[PDB]
Amino acid sequence: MLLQAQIEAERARAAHYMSGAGLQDSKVGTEQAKARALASQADMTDLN
């Protein structure tokens, strides 16, 4: 009980959470790119 509940559960949860944090930090850049692209499209529409 104790051995598995400690090694298997908690360390795995830590790894999962760190991976999630890295993923969010990655997604920030895609958000930036989307913002820039939409701004450019709006500029095109205004020109037309």
Partner: protein, 43 residues
């Protein structure tokens, strides 16, 4: 966007066809008088 604001967008799109058609037709039709001169000098 930059092109449509005063560039190749409306510079070339006439230039291409007008220059090509005019030059081709003019050169062929100028060669027409050369062919006719050959006609006259031959038969």
């Amino acid at each position: 966007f930059l092109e449509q604001e005063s560039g190749v967008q409306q510079a070339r799109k006439r230039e291409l066809q007008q220059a090509q058609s005019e030059a081709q037709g003019k050169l062929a039709m100028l060669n027409s008088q050369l062919k006719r001169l050959d006609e006259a000098t031959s038969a």
